[PDB]
Amino acid sequence: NKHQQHLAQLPKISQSVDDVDFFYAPADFRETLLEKIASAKQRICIVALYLEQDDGGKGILNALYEAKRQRPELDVRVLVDWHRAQRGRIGAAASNTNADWYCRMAQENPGVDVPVYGVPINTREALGVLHFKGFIIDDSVLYSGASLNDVYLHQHDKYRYDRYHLIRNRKMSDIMFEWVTQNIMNGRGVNRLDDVNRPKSPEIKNDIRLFRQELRDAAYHFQGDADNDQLSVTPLVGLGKSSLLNKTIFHLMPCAEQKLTICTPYFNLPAILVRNIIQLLREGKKVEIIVGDKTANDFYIPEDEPFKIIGALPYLYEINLRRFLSRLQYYVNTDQLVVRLWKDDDNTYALKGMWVDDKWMLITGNNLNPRAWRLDLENAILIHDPQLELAPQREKELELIREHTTIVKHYRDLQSIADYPVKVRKLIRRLRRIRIDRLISRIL
Ligand SMILES: CCCCCCCCCCCCCCCC(=O)OC[C@H](COP(=O)(O)OP(=O)(O)OC[C@H]1O[C@@H](n2ccc(N)nc2=O)[C@H](O)[C@@H]1O)OC(=O)CCCCCCCCCCCCCCC
């Protein structure tokens, strides 16, 4: 079996069960992060899509400044997306940016250096973003898809559901930390957001081009020290067709002997992944797909509030799901295909991951969409648990993930375009007439 061989031959870093901690809620993740910031003695590397200027973001940044204040020799770095940091939300009131905020924070803390870098994966945000996940603190990585804001940290009443794994592993964290240092920190495109005279994009357009071309080769290189019959972790990083992550995602699915479970908050599977699923289904195996309700998509705008064009995305992601469910309705009937809609009032959904049987767990920022396949800098940690040492945590986590879901029993239980609000419905129909929906899909 060529797929199983790929996995068997992946380099693997030995992992102690006692150096792996699951957390099951945003608040716990927040507290853990604050716990580790205060405790860190060597380094703190925060890579995130963004670090918002809200109570959540402030909480984390204040704690970083405080850590550096009490340990000047501490190596503290924040890396966020260059483009995202220099704008407000799409279709919101143009405002003070996070980058401006980063500048005020430096000014307001004169003695203490917490460099905030901005990482452009492409010259336009829409064609590439920093989707590298990981908070690297000393010998450990607190790993999550979460960015740093109110909802992701559950600062107040609303939350955004992600996953949270802390892994103490000297070798892995070193590999991840050094990679970030070598391939991002010093690198053409990367500029400091905590500087009022930071450049604009026209000046670095060619720096970004060469940066992307070097990241096209983005990979980790390390010797394996663990065999395929012991708990291990395999850090994976990638961008584009050369991504080892994407190839590992590809080969994982067919390795399922019983069941595959997939999480994504943006359901838009590349054809090659859909074929994997169909294969599994045709072999009598089970496939579980846990996606958010459109109302739990962070692009969703309620009927109440004025409609904005970006608010059409969750509808498109649902169209994708309904089309996918309609094709495979037989397997829903046989109870092999289980599609779960997640919804918890107006809380939002951001879960990623793959589970292959009870043996592999992929924790990743990868949303298994065209964005991750072609555009964005993605990473992951692949946990191999052959002796089932993490079974209590795996089972507990999935139990909690599934709690606020309902199983789709037929595809027509999902709304069709006809049922959508008049402005959305109209917009979407026009896009489908002139096949623009097929085009936009590639950046979704
Ligand atoms: C009214 C004006 C109309 C004009 C529209 C054109 C404007 C385009 C320029 C901006 C392009 C943004 C690209 C973002 C890609 C990204 O973050 O990709 C990664 C992301 C998943 O990252 P993950 O780590 O999983 O985390 P999140 O899910 O929290 O990431 C969501 C990001 O999106 C931001 N956001 C969310 C809601 C909102 N209203 N505005 C925001 O800025 C958040 O602040 C955050 O940065 O994957 C995605 O986000 C998947 C969707 C990609 C969007 C594709 C480009 C924009 C749509 C296309 C234009 C046509 C309109 C639609 C017509 C049907």
Side-chain angles (χ1 to χ4, degrees):
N1 187 300
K2 195 175 177 293
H3 303 289
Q4 281 167 351
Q5 202 182 50
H6 181 267
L7 287 181
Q9 290 171 359
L10 264 182
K12 296 190 185 60
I13 307 164
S14 50
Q15 181 60 53
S16 169
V17 66
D18 295 310
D19 285 342
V20 173
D21 295 297
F22 287 49
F23 305 95
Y24 307 86
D28 298 344
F29 158 70
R30 180 191 69 230
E31 294 300 296
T32 303
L33 175 56
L34 293 164
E35 286 178 4
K36 293 292 185 183
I37 288 165
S39 304
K41 282 172 62 70
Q42 311 159 5
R43 66 192 176 188
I44 305 174
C45 188
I46 304 300
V47 185
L49 182 64
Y50 60 104
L51 169 59
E52 190 70 14
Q53 75 158 303
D54 57 18
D55 287 355
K58 284 161 186 174
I60 307 301
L61 193 59
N62 292 341
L64 291 169
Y65 273 97
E66 180 59 17
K68 180 72 179 188
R69 181 172 296 115
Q70 299 293 343
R71 188 175 288 281
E73 67 274 15
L74 192 67
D75 179 8
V76 181
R77 315 290 181 168
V78 177
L79 286 84
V80 301
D81 194 79
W82 165 262
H83 292 292
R84 178 60 185 70
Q86 291 178 289
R87 63 173 193 72
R89 290 176 54 95
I90 302 165
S95 182
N96 271 175
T97 59
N98 297 323
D100 295 319
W101 177 51
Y102 302 151
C103 300
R104 289 198 302 292
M105 284 294 292
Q107 296 155 11
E108 290 159 6
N109 293 254
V112 181
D113 292 297
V114 182
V116 188
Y117 295 91
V119 172
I121 298 302
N122 210 342
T123 56
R124 287 183 173 67
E125 192 177 337
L127 298 184
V129 294
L130 178 72
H131 215 242
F132 194 91
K133 304 306 181 186
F135 309 149
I136 306 159
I137 307 177
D138 292 0
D139 52 357
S140 302
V141 183
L142 180 58
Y143 194 84
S144 170
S147 294
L148 296 174
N149 66 2
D150 281 9
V151 298
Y152 270 118
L153 296 171
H154 194 186
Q155 202 62 33
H156 293 314
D157 295 302
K158 193 192 293 192
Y159 75 95
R160 179 161 180 64
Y161 199 21
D162 208 302
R163 299 170 66 192
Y164 326 97
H165 302 89
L166 175 68
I167 298 163
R168 183 194 293 289
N169 192 302
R170 169 52 63 191
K171 188 170 177 184
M172 184 175 80
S173 51
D174 278 1
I175 289 161
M176 286 179 65
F177 181 84
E178 289 159 1
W179 190 101
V180 172
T181 309
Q182 283 298 338
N183 293 284
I184 306 291
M185 279 286 277
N186 43 73
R188 297 300 190 294
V190 184
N191 290 256
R192 285 194 59 173
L193 296 170
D194 57 357
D195 175 25
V196 185
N197 305 126
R198 60 186 169 289
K200 273 78 171 189
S201 52
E203 309 180 21
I204 47 173
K205 194 277 294 167
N206 202 282
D207 277 301
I208 294 168
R209 187 279 299 166
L210 184 66
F211 180 33
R212 181 167 188 97
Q213 194 206 72
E214 190 154 3
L215 284 180
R216 177 189 169 196
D217 204 70
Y220 296 132
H221 302 103
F222 61 90
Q223 300 293 106
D225 58 69
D227 309 307
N228 302 140
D229 68 346
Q230 61 188 74
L231 185 67
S232 65
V233 289
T234 296
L236 297 162
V237 59
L239 173 46
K241 46 92 174 203
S242 56
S243 173
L244 180 61
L245 173 59
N246 294 354
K247 293 163 194 175
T248 305
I249 289 166
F250 169 72
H251 291 286
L252 271 164
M253 298 187 183
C255 297
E257 292 297 339
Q258 272 69 243
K259 189 180 179 181
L260 171 71
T261 297
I262 295 298
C263 286
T264 173
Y266 305 113
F267 185 82
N268 184 9
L269 293 174
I272 196 175
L273 295 190
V274 175
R275 271 198 292 290
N276 274 343
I277 290 170
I278 290 174
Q279 175 74 291
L280 288 167
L281 292 179
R282 282 176 176 170
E283 291 167 350
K285 308 200 172 96
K286 187 191 277 277
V287 173
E288 182 186 9
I289 300 179
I290 310 175
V291 284
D293 187 64
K294 64 190 157 190
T295 64
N297 189 291
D298 96 303
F299 288 100
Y300 181 74
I301 313 177
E303 274 80 338
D304 283 348
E305 289 139 62
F307 176 66
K308 297 284 161 60
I309 303 173
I310 198 70
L313 288 191
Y315 294 97
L316 294 175
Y317 286 117
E318 183 183 54
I319 289 162
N320 294 351
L321 183 68
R322 191 173 187 289
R323 196 192 59 241
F324 165 98
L325 263 164
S326 66
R327 282 184 55 196
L328 302 174
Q329 181 58 51
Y330 170 66
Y331 293 110
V332 176
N333 296 352
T334 63
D335 290 299
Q336 292 173 70
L337 179 59
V338 178
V339 172
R340 302 186 178 260
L341 266 311
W342 184 95
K343 185 179 163 51
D344 175 13
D345 303 303
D346 56 352
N347 305 118
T348 60
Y349 182 79
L351 305 184
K352 313 93 168 75
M354 302 182 53
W355 296 251
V356 177
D357 295 338
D358 55 0
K359 290 292 162 68
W360 305 86
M361 294 172 66
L362 185 72
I363 74 179
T364 187
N366 195 313
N367 295 137
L368 308 178
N369 58 351
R371 286 206 71 76
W373 229 244
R374 286 290 172 260
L375 303 185
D376 306 320
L377 177 53
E378 298 291 356
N379 80 342
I381 305 162
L382 175 64
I383 311 169
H384 191 207
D385 182 21
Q387 305 308 319
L388 306 185
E389 297 177 62
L390 295 171
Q393 295 100 297
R394 177 171 44 62
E395 286 167 4
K396 185 184 175 187
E397 184 189 33
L398 279 167
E399 185 184 307
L400 290 173
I401 287 166
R402 290 175 181 133
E403 185 183 347
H404 295 301
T405 69
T406 62
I407 299 181
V408 177
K409 299 158 87 297
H410 196 276
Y411 71 97
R412 298 189 79 181
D413 300 343
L414 302 173
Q415 286 186 337
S416 67
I417 296 165
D419 313 317
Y420 296 165
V422 265
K423 290 189 174 179
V424 183
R425 183 202 300 160
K426 174 171 61 182
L427 164 61
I428 288 179
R429 275 171 172 169
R430 293 175 178 178
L431 289 170
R432 301 177 92 235
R433 277 165 195 159
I434 60 171
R435 272 73 150 181
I436 297 282
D437 68 306
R438 301 269 174 281
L439 209 95
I440 194 185
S441 186
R442 299 181 184 179
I443 58 162
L444 296 190

